[PDB]
Design a protein around this ligand. Sequence first.
Ligand SMILES: *C(=O)/C=C/c1ccc(O)cc1
Length: 125
Amino acid sequence: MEHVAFGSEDIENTLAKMDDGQLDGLAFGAIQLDGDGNILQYNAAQGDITGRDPKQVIGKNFFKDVAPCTDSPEFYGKFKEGVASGNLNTMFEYTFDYQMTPTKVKVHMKKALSGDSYWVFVKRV
Ligand SMILES: *C(=O)/C=C/c1ccc(O)cc1
């Protein structure tokens, strides 16, 4: 277990050092996306919340394939604007309901430090 708090201001600095194994020790869900929304990293805590098997979703498109309920101005729209503007830091509540029991979460999206990557952080509410 990696001690990093959800919403920490310098979270992107902290997570740049972690490899996939250590991401799996976080207390919250973490997804790393490229600028097109393809999944690069998906941790164990996220799979505990959504039921997905982390290794099976890496490489899939989050908005088109895995999470169609986020294909909306309120989620996807915010991501696409942040990728265009090159800056992103927003937190909101959302409900995940595709092929799963409707689950309410807090979502934190933030630009990664390295190049064209973006974090999606999730915890239950
Ligand atoms: C809506 O379709 C949400 C689905 C979803 C959210 C987060 C994930 O990791 C997987 C599925």
